[PDB]
């Protein structure tokens, strides 16, 4: 529910899939610009997050989600139908 605890999990997923150390993932940093993450790793991060969070994002953020701050803001403003 907090931004500063979903960043700590998304940095773990990015570290597992790609290999960036989790001290580099800051919410002002872009994906294909500074982290330099290719598209197969984008699909792999998407299916890992679908496995762990349970939210399904097929195509609405495949071409509209740029930075990790936008990811965590999307997670914050979508969570109103909590299954917990």
């Amino acid at each position: 529910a907090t931004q500063e605890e979903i960043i700590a999990g998304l940095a773990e997923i990015i570290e597992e899939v790609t290999g960036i150390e989790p001290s580099e993932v800051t919410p002002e940093k872009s994906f294909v610009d500074d982290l330099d993450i290719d598209s197969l790793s984008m699909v792999e991060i998407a299916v890992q997050t679908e496995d762990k969070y349970g939210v399904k994002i097929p195509d609405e953020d495949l071409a509209g989600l740029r930075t990790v701050g936008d990811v965590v803001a999307y997670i914050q403003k979508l969570e109103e139908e909590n299954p917990e």
């Binding site: 598209s39 699909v43 399904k56 097929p58 195509d59 495949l62």
Partner: protein
Amino acid sequence: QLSATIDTRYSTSPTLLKLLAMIVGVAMTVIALGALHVLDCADGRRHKR
């Protein structure tokens, strides 16, 4: 009269039934993997390369 049957056991050729079974089996394998792709594209994501 000398006679000798030569061992030509590897000089075979397919019959009609074996040839039709090979053709229909390869065609059914192709159709099965095409249906497997149509099942895999259920989640909305396209090819793009």
